[PDB]
Amino acid sequence: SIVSSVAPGKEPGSLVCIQAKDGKVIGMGARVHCGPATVLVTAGHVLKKGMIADLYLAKYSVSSKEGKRVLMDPTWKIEYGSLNKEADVISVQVPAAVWSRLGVTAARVRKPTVKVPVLAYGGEASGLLQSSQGFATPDGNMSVAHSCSTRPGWSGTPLYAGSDIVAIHRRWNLATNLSIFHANCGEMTWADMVE
């Protein structure tokens, strides 16, 4: 798996880091289209960490040249998901202002196929990301086996095939076939001002 460093702001527009309060990246996620709006998607065990410590959505802003973060409000409503170890995926209806403050654009979900080439992203900070190359194959139920190298911290990160997301990385590699769950589907802004 070719692991490369990614330049600040050069990751996919849909990618977010999920961080503890000291900045530690403890998972990843993405903004995806779901019917007439969009949702955050990530691994269910990443958001379960929110009972251990506060979680922050984080993304690097090119226009500001800095990191941005928003606390994950625990009242955001789920769209779908399952904490079953074979699914371990959760989607959250995140307000528009959150996504706007972070500058996150939405990706489309696509079915994976046998040996589809994929990229996974993670890293230790929002402007210090890496990519790993690999292949992905569906298992015919809910998962996808893949060969992208990942670290702890990369749970919830999408497997991108081209522009689209075909899976959500789970753990040591297995990912969730997201198409299965997606079937159901002047100077300062006020969002920046309120935090």
Which three-class secondary structure state does DSSP give residue 194?
Answer: helix
Q: Catalytic residue, from 1, 45, 82, 179: name it.
A: 45
Q: Catalytic residue, from 14, 91, 132, 155: name it.
A: 155
Q: Are 56 and 74 in contact, with CB atoms under 8 Å apart? A: no
Q: Residue 42 region, left (φ>0) first, then alpha (ψ -120 to 50), else beta? A: beta
Resolution of this structure in Å: 2.1
d(CA 43, CA 127): 22
33 is catalytic: no
Give the closest residue to 93 by CA, choosing from 20, 41, 50. Answer: 41
List the 25-34 sheet strands across, edge first.
66-71, 56-61, 15-19, 25-34, 37-43, 89-92, 78-82
Q: Are 38 and 9 in contact, with CB atoms under 8 Å apart? A: no
| Amino acid at the residue 168 | I
192 is catalytic: no
| Strand pairing class (37-43; 89-92) | antiparallel
88 is catalytic: yes
For residue 117, the enclosing domain spans 1-195
Q: How was this structure determined?
A: X-ray
Overall number of domains in the chain: 1
Q: Catalytic residue, from 88, 126, 143, 146: name it.
A: 88
d(CA 107, CA 38): 9
